[PDB]
Symmetry: C3
């Protein structure tokens, strides 16, 4: 039987701990007014390929390295340059304490304020029913792009997430942003400390979904940003024929900090100087295994003063590697 | 006993997923006149390291991601920047119909006009003897590099490839390029729509190869470009000692669209302002398994008006992974 | 069992040759004076993610492709670009002669002058006792960065290394550098040919180590450089609890070619106007398997004329994969 022993010894020679997964997305975005997605035009057809190496350093720690490449269909000015999107180490300090260090993905609150790249440290204390997440670091994506280390506002975040049943989670968050340069309406302007606090609710009774979120900066006037959505579906990308539909409403005031929202609304701190207010309806359908088509139509877009904005619409296909 | 079976199953988990392959190359190019390969010099000794990830999305769809890096031997100005060279998804809608979407490699016709990166979509029909390939998108590499999306000419291509004889292949193609910016002799000029069309033949039998191709723009004077060549050998990089020799002739006129040809000629639309006409003799030899050595000598290079261009010569070593 | 044997054979069929390894480092560097590590600041905290593919081309040859990405915590101006750091092919013409071609790592002598990226060819000839390594190429990193081929000085190196006793090694080297540009104190200066010859010794016994290196440019005045260090420890990142400590003295003159030293001194030909002379103490400890915490404190930093320089201090975590 030692023959199979040496065969599996050879097994753990030429394979190793690294598991390679990833995805590839082909997306089309557009609007009826020029400049929403690509300057001087009203349509952006682009694609992205991501390859993620997940390696186990030891039994109690693992690290992740993701190589990401974006391109636009026909854009030949520069090569589809690869960028290390995620590079972090995940320590597991037992059954209740976990930590992340490096360039990971952070979600401030329910994701309305920020869900993207974040260089720093994160500590998770989890009862498995009530969870606490505390982060310290720097934002990288969205309205926080283009800032050097001495201009990028540091984020000190503490968030609580509890469950009120099966699949239903409520939560809150409190974050402190230092003085730094943020991008409003394409202009990088400096701002003082902000104490952004908010709450979110999510309910998944049966296959019905009902979610909402409200965040506000404590000291900055006119900063209340909230969202509220309903939906029906059972969307699983790995299972064929599982669809989903949802409709949601966004209301972001003039000074509301929306750096890079987890949602797909087209107006945030970078795009607007007078807020955003309107609906968006999204649809998902897994056409094949590990292949998913998505569509979205955002309408009734308005400014805070009653002015009118541009409707938008997107449609994309996502494919996964591993399994 | 069962634990070993569970370990074998865990191995079985990570085998049908992402498969990592690739290659490396150490190449040297030179010419008898400066500026053909590198600005203000007559030689360029560089390399390349490509790593590709063939991942099966599911039993009827796979995706390919390739990371490449080009560095000159001694050029320390910039780093060996890694680029996503290929990023596409390939679908099989049955036994014959297939499709590709994303940044994939397109070969317009036989490869004399373009065989390189393509941004768009491709549809393949046909079972085993007649194959129809319809591509729609944008060229990226070659004479179409440096253009933006709004300046890049859009290619609508349909090509037919028939199998004749035991393994001979004949074919033709018709492609339409929208108005856009293209690189003529180092300057980006805006050309109108073109309707290019051509034919090719490839008769190979008993270690003897004879190939030919001819393409032409419909509404452009002196735009035809053709190649014709012979060869003898059984080259196969995965088998040691499999040599190969070949010799071929190119003649592409001043307006002939040669964006990035599949052959190793040093002159195309980017380098020549009045055409190209000359011979090239090439040799290949697999010195080891999965290792190959290639050499090439392009001579008799002349302009369409009799002006004499410069000879060129290349020597490269390609190592194939997996 | 026979069916399981056939299954193991089938799995062995689908194994390929590419083995994915790598590492992830989170580092902090600082100095008592600004400009040593980062411009107009006295602290530089950053991170690195490297993923290495070891492909086995055939029985007597392999190739290596390394994708490396360096980022700074908070620096969002320029993305964490992925660069091909190593790309080379290794040939084995028997049990004695080996060759390398491409972009690999070269260790000129003991590593004080250079242990970093190299573009060219290398040839190793020798048995288990004596090794002779001859390399022709270009330096890419260190003080030779930022140069094109026409300015990058070609390096012709030949180094002999003989093992004395067990786990201890002595050796020497002779290297010839052509005329080219080098980054002296932030200014690219064109220098003529150099003939740098040197010796090194590395005595290891049980858990104690005594190392020394001395290199000199033959035709350049005030170009001598040397280091001498003593260490105690049994460091091995793959094993938990294996500590290590060492203390070493660097004395390198104004014209001594120190492009990219394998040590951790911050003053090498690129931020020195009058050389470097001072001590550095380093402490390593593998806190977990494949995880290692390192710290370093360089003090008594002075010029060759007696004018003092700035202290420096570093602290980093290294995570390794694959093995």
């Amino acid at each position: 039987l030692n023959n199979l022993g040496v065969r599996v010894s050879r097994l753990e020679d030429r394979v190793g701990n690294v598991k390679v997964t990833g995805d590839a997305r082909i997306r089309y975005q557009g609007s009826e007014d020029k400049g929403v997605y690509k300057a001087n035009s009203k349509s952006l057809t682009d694609g992205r390929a991501r390859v993620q190496f997940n390696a186990n350093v030891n039994d109690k720690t693992q690290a992740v390295v993701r190589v990401k490449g974006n391109y636009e269909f026909g854009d030949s000015t520069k090569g589809s340059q690869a960028t290390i999107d995620r590079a972090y180490v995940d320590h597991k300090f037992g059954s209740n304490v976990s930590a992340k260090a490096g360039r990971f993905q952070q979600t401030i609150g329910g994701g309305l304020m920020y869900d993207d790249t974040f260089d720093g440290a994160q500590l998770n204390v989890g009862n498995d029913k009530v969870q606490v997440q505390g982060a310290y670091g720097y934002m990288i994506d969205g309205a926080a792009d283009g800032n050097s280390k001495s201009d990028n506002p540091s984020v000190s975040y503490v968030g609580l997430k509890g469950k009120v049943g099966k699949e239903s989670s409520v939560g809150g968050f409190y974050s402190r942003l230092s003085s730094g340069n943020l991008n409003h309406n394409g202009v990088t302007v400096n701002s003082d400390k902000q104490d952004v606090y908010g709450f979110n609710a999510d309910f998944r009774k049966n296959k019905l979904w009902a979610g909402g979120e409200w965040l506000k900066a404590s000291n900055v006037d006119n900063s209340q940003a909230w969202t509220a959505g309903l939906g029906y579906g059972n969307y699983d990308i790995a299972k064929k024929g599982t669809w989903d539909v949802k409709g949601q409403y966004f209301n972001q005031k003039a000074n509301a900090p929306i750096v890079s929202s987890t949602w797909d609304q087209a107006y945030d701190l970078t795009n607007t100087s007078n807020g955003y207010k309107g609906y968006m309806a999204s649809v998902d359908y897994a056409v094949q295994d590990n292949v998913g088509l998505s569509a979205g139509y955002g309408f009734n877009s308005k400014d805070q003063s009653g002015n009118d904005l541009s409707d938008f619409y997107r449609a994309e296909l996502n494919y996964k590697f591993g399994g």
